[PDB]
Amino acid sequence: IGINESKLLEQLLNEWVSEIENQTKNFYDQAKTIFVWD
Amino acid sequence: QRIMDNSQKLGKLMDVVVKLNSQQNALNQCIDVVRDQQALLERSLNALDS
């Protein structure tokens, strides 16, 4: 995906903050799952 | 009085011409949105097709 030329930088930052907190949860639960497999 | 009434009426309409200039800048941005998303989908299809 390329960033949309029309998007507000405020929208784009809040969109990426939400996605980085989704990715933060999934990183810790995937790593916690890998630790059980160890 | 009626000249002052019509003068305040014209003024309060001119204050709202400033809002019509705002809707034109929002509409211009919507015409940026669709142009450059279409030119990006076009480009991503050519980058999958190839």
Side-chain angles (χ1 to χ4, degrees):
Chain A
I1 307 165
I3 300 161
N4 194 2
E5 288 286 304
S6 60
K7 256 183 171 178
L8 299 166
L9 187 58
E10 204 169 302
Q11 293 174 296
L12 187 69
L13 183 62
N14 297 339
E15 177 171 73
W16 290 343
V17 165
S18 190
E19 184 67 290
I20 286 304
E21 295 198 351
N22 169 54
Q23 289 179 12
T24 298
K25 184 186 178 191
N26 282 272
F27 173 87
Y28 281 105
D29 289 302
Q30 286 185 5
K32 168 190 172 187
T33 303
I34 288 171
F35 177 91
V36 172
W37 299 332
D38 301 329
Chain B
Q1 185 181 352
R2 294 184 69 203
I3 291 165
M4 189 165 174
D5 308 329
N6 284 338
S7 187
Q8 284 201 33
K9 186 179 181 186
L10 181 61
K12 291 166 189 172
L13 266 54
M14 194 65 185
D15 308 327
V16 180
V17 177
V18 188
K19 302 182 184 179
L20 292 176
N21 294 299
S22 196
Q23 300 313 88
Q24 190 61 77
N25 282 282
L27 177 59
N28 292 350
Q29 186 168 346
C30 299
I31 295 167
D32 301 312
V33 175
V34 179
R35 180 191 66 234
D36 301 336
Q37 281 221 17
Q38 284 183 356
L40 182 64
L41 176 59
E42 176 196 290
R43 193 183 309 143
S44 290
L45 289 171
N46 293 330
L48 186 55
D49 183 359
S50 189

Coordinates of all heavy atoms in Angstrom, one line a residue:
Chain A
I1 N 0.9 -1.2 0.0 CA 0.0 0.0 0.0 C 0.9 1.2 0.0 O 1.9 1.2 0.7 CB -1.0 0.0 1.2 CG1 -1.8 -1.3 1.3 CG2 -1.9 1.2 1.1 CD1 -2.5 -1.5 2.7
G2 N 0.6 2.2 -0.8 CA 1.2 3.6 -0.7 C 0.2 4.5 0.2 O -1.0 4.3 0.1
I3 N 0.8 5.4 1.0 CA -0.1 6.3 1.8 C -0.9 7.1 0.8 O -0.4 7.6 -0.2 CB 0.8 7.2 2.7 CG1 1.6 6.3 3.7 CG2 -0.1 8.2 3.5 CD1 2.8 7.1 4.3
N4 N -2.2 7.3 1.2 CA -3.1 8.1 0.3 C -2.7 9.6 0.4 O -2.6 10.2 1.5 CB -4.6 7.9 0.7 CG -5.5 8.5 -0.3 OD1 -5.1 9.0 -1.4 ND2 -6.8 8.4 -0.2
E5 N -2.5 10.3 -0.7 CA -2.1 11.7 -0.9 C -3.1 12.6 -0.2 O -2.6 13.7 0.4 CB -2.0 12.0 -2.4 CG -0.7 11.4 -3.0 CD 0.6 12.1 -2.6 OE1 0.7 13.3 -2.8 OE2 1.5 11.4 -2.2
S6 N -4.3 12.3 -0.1 CA -5.4 13.1 0.6 C -5.4 13.0 2.1 O -6.1 13.8 2.7 CB -6.7 12.7 0.0 OG -6.9 11.3 0.3
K7 N -4.9 11.9 2.7 CA -5.1 11.7 4.2 C -4.5 12.7 5.1 O -3.3 13.2 4.8 CB -4.6 10.2 4.5 CG -5.8 9.3 4.7 CD -5.3 7.9 5.1 CE -6.5 7.0 5.5 NZ -6.0 5.6 5.9
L8 N -5.1 13.1 6.2 CA -4.6 13.9 7.2 C -3.6 13.2 8.0 O -3.8 12.0 8.4 CB -5.7 14.5 8.1 CG -6.8 15.3 7.3 CD1 -8.1 15.5 8.2 CD2 -6.3 16.7 7.0
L9 N -2.5 13.8 8.4 CA -1.4 13.2 9.2 C -1.8 12.8 10.6 O -1.3 11.8 11.1 CB -0.2 14.2 9.2 CG 1.1 13.7 9.8 CD1 1.6 12.5 9.1 CD2 2.1 14.8 9.7
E10 N -2.8 13.4 11.1 CA -3.5 13.1 12.4 C -4.2 11.7 12.3 O -4.1 10.8 13.1 CB -4.5 14.2 12.7 CG -4.9 14.3 14.2 CD -5.6 15.6 14.5 OE1 -5.1 16.6 14.2 OE2 -6.8 15.4 15.0
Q11 N -5.0 11.5 11.2 CA -5.7 10.3 10.9 C -4.7 9.1 10.7 O -4.8 8.1 11.3 CB -6.5 10.3 9.6 CG -7.7 11.3 9.7 CD -8.4 11.4 8.3 OE1 -7.8 11.9 7.3 NE2 -9.6 10.9 8.1
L12 N -3.6 9.4 9.9 CA -2.6 8.4 9.6 C -1.8 8.0 10.9 O -1.5 6.8 11.0 CB -1.7 9.0 8.6 CG -0.6 8.1 8.0 CD1 -1.2 7.0 7.1 CD2 0.4 8.9 7.1
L13 N -1.5 8.9 11.8 CA -0.8 8.6 13.0 C -1.7 7.8 14.0 O -1.2 6.8 14.5 CB -0.4 10.0 13.7 CG 0.4 9.8 15.0 CD1 1.7 9.0 14.7 CD2 0.8 11.1 15.5
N14 N -3.0 8.2 14.1 CA -3.9 7.4 15.0 C -4.2 6.0 14.5 O -4.2 5.0 15.2 CB -5.2 8.3 15.2 CG -5.0 9.6 15.8 OD1 -4.0 9.8 16.6 ND2 -5.9 10.5 15.7
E15 N -4.3 5.9 13.1 CA -4.4 4.6 12.4 C -3.2 3.7 12.7 O -3.4 2.5 13.1 CB -4.6 5.0 10.9 CG -4.7 3.8 9.9 CD -5.1 4.4 8.5 OE1 -4.2 5.0 7.8 OE2 -6.2 4.2 8.1
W16 N -2.0 4.2 12.5 CA -0.8 3.5 12.8 C -0.5 3.2 14.3 O 0.0 2.2 14.6 CB 0.4 4.3 12.3 CG 0.6 4.3 10.8 CD1 0.0 3.6 9.8 CD2 1.5 5.3 10.1 NE1 0.5 3.9 8.6 CE2 1.4 4.9 8.7 CE3 2.3 6.3 10.5 CZ2 2.2 5.6 7.7 CZ3 3.1 7.0 9.5 CH2 3.0 6.7 8.1
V17 N -1.0 4.1 15.2 CA -0.9 3.8 16.7 C -1.8 2.6 17.1 O -1.3 1.7 17.7 CB -1.2 5.1 17.5 CG1 -1.5 4.8 19.0 CG2 0.0 6.0 17.5
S18 N -3.0 2.6 16.6 CA -4.0 1.5 16.8 C -3.4 0.2 16.2 O -3.3 -0.8 17.0 CB -5.3 1.8 16.1 OG -6.3 0.9 16.4
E19 N -2.8 0.2 15.0 CA -2.2 -1.0 14.4 C -0.9 -1.5 15.2 O -0.8 -2.7 15.4 CB -1.9 -0.7 12.9 CG -1.3 -1.9 12.2 CD -2.3 -3.0 12.0 OE1 -2.6 -3.7 13.0 OE2 -2.7 -3.3 10.8
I20 N -0.1 -0.6 15.7 CA 1.1 -0.9 16.5 C 0.6 -1.5 17.9 O 1.4 -2.3 18.4 CB 2.1 0.2 16.6 CG1 2.9 0.4 15.3 CG2 3.1 0.1 17.8 CD1 3.6 -0.8 14.8
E21 N -0.5 -1.1 18.4 CA -1.0 -1.7 19.7 C -1.7 -3.1 19.4 O -1.4 -4.0 20.2 CB -1.8 -0.7 20.5 CG -0.9 0.4 20.9 CD -1.4 1.3 22.1 OE1 -2.5 1.2 22.5 OE2 -0.5 2.0 22.6
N22 N -2.4 -3.3 18.3 CA -2.8 -4.6 17.8 C -1.6 -5.5 17.6 O -1.5 -6.6 18.2 CB -3.6 -4.4 16.5 CG -3.8 -5.7 15.8 OD1 -4.3 -6.7 16.3 ND2 -3.4 -5.8 14.6
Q23 N -0.6 -5.1 16.9 CA 0.7 -5.8 16.7 C 1.4 -6.1 18.0 O 2.0 -7.2 18.2 CB 1.6 -5.1 15.7 CG 1.1 -5.1 14.3 CD 2.0 -4.4 13.3 OE1 3.1 -3.9 13.6 NE2 1.6 -4.2 12.1
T24 N 1.4 -5.1 19.0 CA 2.0 -5.3 20.3 C 1.3 -6.5 21.0 O 2.0 -7.4 21.5 CB 2.0 -4.0 21.2 OG1 2.7 -3.0 20.6 CG2 2.6 -4.2 22.5
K25 N 0.0 -6.5 21.1 CA -0.7 -7.7 21.7 C -0.4 -9.0 21.0 O 0.1 -9.9 21.7 CB -2.3 -7.5 21.6 CG -3.0 -8.6 22.4 CD -4.5 -8.6 22.3 CE -5.1 -9.8 23.0 NZ -6.5 -10.0 22.7
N26 N -0.5 -9.1 19.7 CA -0.2 -10.3 18.9 C 1.2 -10.8 19.1 O 1.5 -11.9 19.2 CB -0.6 -10.1 17.5 CG -2.1 -10.1 17.2 OD1 -2.6 -11.2 17.0 ND2 -2.8 -9.0 17.3
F27 N 2.2 -9.8 19.1 CA 3.6 -10.2 19.4 C 3.8 -10.9 20.8 O 4.4 -12.0 20.9 CB 4.5 -8.9 19.4 CG 5.9 -9.2 19.8 CD1 6.9 -9.6 18.9 CD2 6.3 -9.0 21.1 CE1 8.2 -9.9 19.3 CE2 7.6 -9.2 21.6 CZ 8.6 -9.7 20.6
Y28 N 3.2 -10.4 21.9 CA 3.3 -11.0 23.2 C 2.5 -12.3 23.3 O 3.1 -13.2 23.9 CB 2.9 -10.0 24.3 CG 4.0 -9.0 24.6 CD1 3.9 -7.6 24.2 CD2 5.1 -9.4 25.3 CE1 5.0 -6.8 24.3 CE2 6.2 -8.5 25.5 CZ 6.1 -7.2 25.0 OH 7.2 -6.4 25.1
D29 N 1.3 -12.4 22.7 CA 0.6 -13.7 22.7 C 1.2 -14.8 21.8 O 1.2 -15.9 22.2 CB -0.9 -13.5 22.5 CG -1.6 -12.8 23.8 OD1 -1.5 -13.4 24.8 OD2 -2.3 -11.8 23.6
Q30 N 1.7 -14.4 20.6 CA 2.5 -15.3 19.8 C 3.8 -15.8 20.5 O 4.1 -17.0 20.5 CB 2.8 -14.7 18.4 CG 1.6 -14.7 17.5 CD 1.8 -14.2 16.1 OE1 3.0 -14.0 15.6 NE2 0.8 -14.1 15.2
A31 N 4.5 -14.9 21.1 CA 5.8 -15.2 21.9 C 5.5 -16.1 23.1 O 6.2 -17.1 23.3 CB 6.5 -13.9 22.2
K32 N 4.4 -15.8 23.9 CA 3.9 -16.6 25.0 C 3.5 -18.0 24.5 O 3.7 -18.9 25.2 CB 2.7 -15.8 25.5 CG 1.7 -16.4 26.4 CD 0.5 -15.4 26.5 CE -0.8 -15.9 27.3 NZ -1.8 -14.8 27.1
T33 N 2.9 -18.1 23.3 CA 2.6 -19.4 22.7 C 3.9 -20.2 22.3 O 4.0 -21.4 22.7 CB 1.7 -19.2 21.5 OG1 0.5 -18.5 21.9 CG2 1.2 -20.6 20.9
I34 N 4.9 -19.6 21.7 CA 6.2 -20.1 21.4 C 6.9 -20.6 22.8 O 7.4 -21.7 22.8 CB 7.0 -19.1 20.6 CG1 6.5 -19.0 19.2 CG2 8.6 -19.4 20.6 CD1 7.2 -17.9 18.4
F35 N 6.7 -19.8 23.9 CA 7.3 -20.2 25.2 C 6.6 -21.5 25.7 O 7.3 -22.4 26.3 CB 7.1 -19.1 26.1 CG 7.6 -19.3 27.5 CD1 8.9 -19.1 27.9 CD2 6.7 -19.9 28.5 CE1 9.3 -19.4 29.2 CE2 7.1 -20.2 29.8 CZ 8.5 -20.0 30.2
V36 N 5.3 -21.7 25.5 CA 4.7 -23.0 25.9 C 5.2 -24.1 25.1 O 5.5 -25.2 25.6 CB 3.1 -22.8 25.8 CG1 2.4 -24.2 26.0 CG2 2.6 -21.9 26.9
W37 N 5.4 -23.9 23.8 CA 6.0 -25.0 22.9 C 7.5 -25.3 23.3 O 7.8 -26.5 23.3 CB 5.9 -24.6 21.4 CG 4.5 -24.4 20.9 CD1 3.4 -25.0 21.4 CD2 4.1 -23.6 19.8 NE1 2.3 -24.6 20.7 CE2 2.6 -23.7 19.7 CE3 4.7 -22.7 18.9 CZ2 1.9 -23.0 18.7 CZ3 4.0 -21.9 18.0 CH2 2.6 -22.1 17.9
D38 N 8.3 -24.4 23.8 CA 9.6 -24.7 24.4 C 9.5 -25.7 25.5 O 10.2 -26.7 25.5 CB 10.3 -23.4 25.0 CG 10.6 -22.3 24.0 OD1 10.8 -22.6 22.8 OD2 10.8 -21.2 24.4
Chain B
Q1 N -33.6 52.5 8.3 CA -33.7 51.1 8.9 C -33.7 50.0 7.8 O -32.8 49.2 7.9 CB -35.0 51.1 9.7 CG -35.1 49.7 10.4 CD -36.4 49.5 11.3 OE1 -37.2 50.4 11.5 NE2 -36.5 48.3 11.8
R2 N -34.5 50.1 6.8 CA -34.5 49.1 5.7 C -33.2 48.9 4.9 O -32.9 47.9 4.4 CB -35.7 49.3 4.8 CG -37.1 49.1 5.5 CD -38.2 49.3 4.5 NE -38.2 48.2 3.6 CZ -38.7 48.1 2.3 NH1 -39.4 49.1 1.7 NH2 -38.6 47.0 1.7
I3 N -32.5 50.0 4.8 CA -31.1 50.0 4.2 C -30.1 49.3 5.2 O -29.3 48.5 4.7 CB -30.7 51.4 3.8 CG1 -31.5 51.9 2.6 CG2 -29.2 51.4 3.4 CD1 -31.4 53.4 2.3
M4 N -30.2 49.5 6.5 CA -29.4 48.9 7.5 C -29.8 47.4 7.7 O -28.9 46.6 7.8 CB -29.5 49.7 8.8 CG -28.5 49.2 9.9 SD -28.3 50.4 11.2 CE -27.3 49.5 12.4
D5 N -31.1 47.0 7.6 CA -31.5 45.6 7.6 C -31.0 44.9 6.4 O -30.3 43.8 6.6 CB -33.1 45.6 7.5 CG -33.9 46.4 8.6 OD1 -33.3 46.5 9.7 OD2 -35.0 46.8 8.3
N6 N -31.1 45.4 5.2 CA -30.6 44.8 4.0 C -29.0 44.8 4.0 O -28.4 43.8 3.5 CB -31.1 45.6 2.7 CG -32.5 45.3 2.3 OD1 -33.1 44.3 2.6 ND2 -33.1 46.1 1.5
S7 N -28.4 45.7 4.6 CA -26.9 45.8 4.8 C -26.4 44.6 5.7 O -25.5 43.9 5.4 CB -26.5 47.1 5.2 OG -25.1 47.2 5.3
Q8 N -27.1 44.5 6.9 CA -26.8 43.3 7.8 C -27.1 42.0 7.1 O -26.3 41.0 7.3 CB -27.6 43.4 9.1 CG -27.0 44.4 10.1 CD -27.5 44.1 11.5 OE1 -27.7 43.0 11.9 NE2 -27.7 45.2 12.3
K9 N -28.1 41.9 6.3 CA -28.5 40.7 5.5 C -27.4 40.3 4.5 O -26.9 39.2 4.5 CB -29.9 40.9 4.9 CG -30.4 39.7 4.2 CD -31.8 40.0 3.6 CE -32.5 38.8 2.9 NZ -33.8 39.2 2.2
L10 N -26.9 41.3 3.7 CA -25.8 41.1 2.8 C -24.5 40.7 3.5 O -23.8 39.8 3.1 CB -25.6 42.4 2.0 CG -24.4 42.3 0.9 CD1 -24.6 41.2 -0.1 CD2 -24.3 43.6 0.2
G11 N -24.1 41.4 4.6 CA -23.0 41.0 5.5 C -23.0 39.6 5.9 O -22.1 38.8 5.6
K12 N -24.1 39.1 6.6 CA -24.3 37.8 7.1 C -24.3 36.7 6.0 O -23.8 35.6 6.3 CB -25.5 37.7 7.9 CG -25.4 38.5 9.2 CD -26.7 38.8 9.9 CE -26.5 39.8 11.1 NZ -27.7 40.3 11.7
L13 N -24.7 37.0 4.8 CA -24.5 36.2 3.6 C -23.0 36.1 3.1 O -22.5 35.1 2.8 CB -25.4 36.7 2.5 CG -26.8 35.9 2.4 CD1 -27.6 35.9 3.7 CD2 -27.6 36.6 1.3
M14 N -22.3 37.2 3.2 CA -20.9 37.3 2.8 C -20.0 36.5 3.8 O -19.1 35.8 3.4 CB -20.4 38.7 2.7 CG -19.0 38.9 2.0 SD -19.0 38.4 0.3 CE -17.2 38.5 -0.1
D15 N -20.3 36.5 5.1 CA -19.7 35.6 6.1 C -19.9 34.1 5.8 O -19.0 33.3 6.1 CB -20.3 35.9 7.5 CG -20.2 37.4 7.9 OD1 -19.3 38.1 7.5 OD2 -21.1 37.8 8.7
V16 N -21.0 33.8 5.1 CA -21.3 32.4 4.6 C -20.7 32.1 3.2 O -20.3 30.9 3.0 CB -22.8 32.1 4.7 CG1 -23.1 30.7 4.3 CG2 -23.2 32.2 6.2
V17 N -20.3 33.1 2.4 CA -19.5 32.9 1.2 C -18.1 32.4 1.6 O -17.5 31.5 0.9 CB -19.3 34.2 0.4 CG1 -18.4 34.0 -0.8 CG2 -20.7 34.6 -0.2
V18 N -17.6 32.8 2.8 CA -16.3 32.2 3.4 C -16.5 30.7 3.6 O -15.5 29.9 3.4 CB -15.9 32.9 4.6 CG1 -14.5 32.4 5.1 CG2 -15.8 34.4 4.4
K19 N -17.7 30.2 4.0 CA -18.0 28.8 4.2 C -18.1 28.0 2.8 O -17.6 26.9 2.7 CB -19.2 28.6 5.0 CG -19.1 29.2 6.4 CD -20.4 28.9 7.2 CE -20.4 29.6 8.6 NZ -21.7 29.3 9.3
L20 N -18.7 28.6 1.8 CA -18.7 28.1 0.4 C -17.2 27.9 -0.1 O -16.9 26.8 -0.7 CB -19.5 28.9 -0.5 CG -21.0 28.9 -0.2 CD1 -21.7 29.9 -1.2 CD2 -21.7 27.6 -0.4
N21 N -16.3 28.8 0.2 CA -14.9 28.6 -0.1 C -14.3 27.5 0.7 O -13.3 26.8 0.2 CB -14.1 29.9 0.1 CG -14.5 31.1 -0.8 OD1 -14.3 31.0 -2.0 ND2 -14.9 32.2 -0.3
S22 N -14.8 27.2 1.9 CA -14.3 26.0 2.6 C -14.8 24.7 2.0 O -14.0 23.8 1.7 CB -14.8 26.1 4.1 OG -14.1 25.1 4.9
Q23 N -16.1 24.6 1.6 CA -16.6 23.4 0.9 C -15.9 23.1 -0.4 O -15.6 22.0 -0.7 CB -18.2 23.5 0.7 CG -19.0 23.6 2.0 CD -18.6 22.6 3.1 OE1 -17.7 22.9 3.9 NE2 -19.2 21.5 3.1
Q24 N -15.6 24.2 -1.2 CA -14.7 24.0 -2.4 C -13.4 23.4 -2.1 O -12.9 22.6 -2.9 CB -14.6 25.3 -3.2 CG -14.0 25.2 -4.6 CD -14.8 24.3 -5.5 OE1 -15.8 24.7 -6.0 NE2 -14.4 23.0 -5.7
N25 N -12.7 23.7 -1.0 CA -11.4 23.1 -0.6 C -11.6 21.7 -0.1 O -10.7 20.9 -0.4 CB -10.7 24.0 0.4 CG -10.0 25.2 -0.3 OD1 -9.0 25.1 -0.9 ND2 -10.6 26.4 -0.3
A26 N -12.7 21.3 0.5 CA -13.0 19.9 0.9 C -13.3 19.1 -0.4 O -12.7 18.1 -0.6 CB -14.2 20.0 1.8
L27 N -14.1 19.6 -1.3 CA -14.4 19.0 -2.6 C -13.2 18.8 -3.5 O -13.0 17.8 -4.1 CB -15.5 19.8 -3.3 CG -15.9 19.4 -4.7 CD1 -16.4 17.9 -4.7 CD2 -17.0 20.3 -5.2
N28 N -12.3 19.8 -3.5 CA -11.0 19.7 -4.2 C -10.2 18.5 -3.6 O -9.7 17.7 -4.4 CB -10.2 21.0 -4.1 CG -10.8 22.2 -4.8 OD1 -11.7 22.1 -5.6 ND2 -10.2 23.3 -4.6
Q29 N -10.2 18.4 -2.3 CA -9.5 17.3 -1.6 C -10.1 15.9 -2.0 O -9.4 15.0 -2.3 CB -9.4 17.5 -0.1 CG -8.6 16.5 0.7 CD -8.3 16.9 2.1 OE1 -8.6 18.1 2.5 NE2 -7.8 16.1 3.0
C30 N -11.5 15.8 -2.1 CA -12.1 14.6 -2.5 C -11.8 14.2 -4.0 O -11.7 13.1 -4.3 CB -13.6 14.8 -2.4 SG -14.1 15.0 -0.6
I31 N -11.5 15.2 -4.8 CA -11.0 15.1 -6.2 C -9.5 14.7 -6.3 O -9.1 14.0 -7.2 CB -11.5 16.3 -7.1 CG1 -13.0 16.3 -7.1 CG2 -10.9 16.3 -8.5 CD1 -13.6 17.7 -7.7
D32 N -8.7 15.1 -5.3 CA -7.4 14.5 -5.1 C -7.4 13.0 -4.6 O -6.7 12.2 -5.2 CB -6.5 15.3 -4.1 CG -6.3 16.8 -4.5 OD1 -5.9 17.0 -5.7 OD2 -6.4 17.7 -3.6
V33 N -8.3 12.7 -3.6 CA -8.5 11.3 -3.1 C -8.6 10.3 -4.2 O -7.8 9.4 -4.3 CB -9.7 11.3 -2.2 CG1 -9.9 9.8 -1.7 CG2 -9.7 12.1 -0.9
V34 N -9.7 10.5 -5.0 CA -10.1 9.4 -5.9 C -9.1 9.3 -7.1 O -8.8 8.2 -7.5 CB -11.6 9.7 -6.4 CG1 -12.1 8.6 -7.4 CG2 -12.5 9.7 -5.2
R35 N -8.6 10.4 -7.6 CA -7.6 10.4 -8.6 C -6.4 9.6 -8.3 O -5.9 8.8 -9.0 CB -7.2 11.9 -8.9 CG -6.1 12.1 -10.0 CD -5.6 13.5 -10.0 NE -4.8 13.8 -8.8 CZ -5.0 14.8 -7.9 NH1 -5.9 15.7 -8.1 NH2 -4.3 15.0 -6.9
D36 N -5.8 9.9 -7.1 CA -4.5 9.3 -6.7 C -4.6 7.9 -6.0 O -3.7 7.1 -6.2 CB -3.7 10.3 -5.9 CG -3.4 11.6 -6.7 OD1 -3.4 11.6 -7.9 OD2 -3.1 12.6 -6.1
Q37 N -5.8 7.6 -5.4 CA -6.1 6.1 -5.2 C -6.3 5.3 -6.4 O -5.7 4.3 -6.6 CB -7.4 6.0 -4.3 CG -7.1 6.2 -2.8 CD -7.9 5.2 -1.8 OE1 -8.3 4.2 -2.2 NE2 -8.0 5.5 -0.6
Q38 N -7.1 5.8 -7.4 CA -7.2 5.1 -8.7 C -5.9 4.9 -9.4 O -5.6 3.8 -9.9 CB -8.2 5.9 -9.7 CG -9.7 5.7 -9.3 CD -10.6 6.4 -10.2 OE1 -10.3 7.0 -11.2 NE2 -11.9 6.2 -10.0
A39 N -5.0 6.0 -9.5 CA -3.7 5.9 -10.0 C -2.7 5.0 -9.2 O -1.6 4.6 -9.7 CB -3.1 7.3 -10.1
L40 N -3.0 4.7 -7.9 CA -2.3 3.7 -7.1 C -2.8 2.3 -7.3 O -2.0 1.4 -7.4 CB -2.4 4.2 -5.6 CG -1.6 3.3 -4.6 CD1 -0.1 3.3 -4.9 CD2 -1.9 3.8 -3.2
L41 N -4.1 2.0 -7.3 CA -4.7 0.7 -7.6 C -4.3 0.2 -9.0 O -3.7 -0.9 -9.2 CB -6.3 0.8 -7.5 CG -7.0 -0.5 -7.9 CD1 -6.6 -1.7 -7.1 CD2 -8.5 -0.3 -7.7
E42 N -4.4 1.1 -10.1 CA -3.8 0.9 -11.4 C -2.4 0.4 -11.4 O -2.0 -0.6 -12.0 CB -3.8 2.3 -12.0 CG -3.2 2.5 -13.4 CD -3.0 4.0 -13.7 OE1 -4.0 4.7 -13.8 OE2 -1.8 4.4 -13.6
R43 N -1.5 1.0 -10.5 CA -0.1 0.8 -10.4 C 0.2 -0.5 -9.6 O 1.1 -1.2 -10.0 CB 0.5 2.0 -9.7 CG 2.0 2.1 -9.7 CD 2.4 3.4 -8.9 NE 1.7 4.6 -9.4 CZ 1.3 5.6 -8.7 NH1 1.6 5.8 -7.4 NH2 0.5 6.5 -9.2
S44 N -0.6 -0.8 -8.6 CA -0.5 -2.1 -7.8 C -1.1 -3.3 -8.7 O -0.4 -4.4 -8.6 CB -1.3 -2.0 -6.5 OG -0.6 -1.1 -5.7
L45 N -2.1 -3.1 -9.5 CA -2.5 -4.1 -10.5 C -1.4 -4.4 -11.5 O -1.0 -5.6 -11.6 CB -3.8 -3.7 -11.2 CG -5.1 -3.7 -10.3 CD1 -6.2 -3.0 -11.0 CD2 -5.5 -5.1 -9.9
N46 N -0.8 -3.4 -12.1 CA 0.3 -3.6 -13.0 C 1.5 -4.3 -12.3 O 2.3 -5.0 -12.9 CB 0.8 -2.2 -13.6 CG -0.3 -1.6 -14.5 OD1 -1.0 -2.3 -15.2 ND2 -0.3 -0.3 -14.6
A47 N 1.7 -4.1 -11.0 CA 2.7 -4.7 -10.1 C 2.4 -6.1 -9.6 O 3.2 -6.8 -9.0 CB 3.1 -3.8 -9.0
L48 N 1.2 -6.6 -9.9 CA 0.7 -8.0 -9.6 C 0.6 -8.8 -10.9 O 1.3 -9.8 -11.0 CB -0.6 -7.9 -8.9 CG -1.2 -9.2 -8.4 CD1 -0.2 -10.0 -7.5 CD2 -2.5 -9.0 -7.6
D49 N 0.0 -8.2 -12.0 CA -0.1 -8.7 -13.3 C 1.3 -9.2 -13.9 O 1.5 -10.3 -14.3 CB -0.7 -7.6 -14.2 CG -1.0 -7.9 -15.6 OD1 -0.6 -9.0 -16.1 OD2 -1.5 -7.1 -16.4
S50 N 2.3 -8.3 -13.8 CA 3.6 -8.5 -14.3 C 4.3 -9.7 -13.6 O 5.3 -10.3 -14.2 CB 4.4 -7.2 -14.1 OG 5.7 -7.2 -14.7

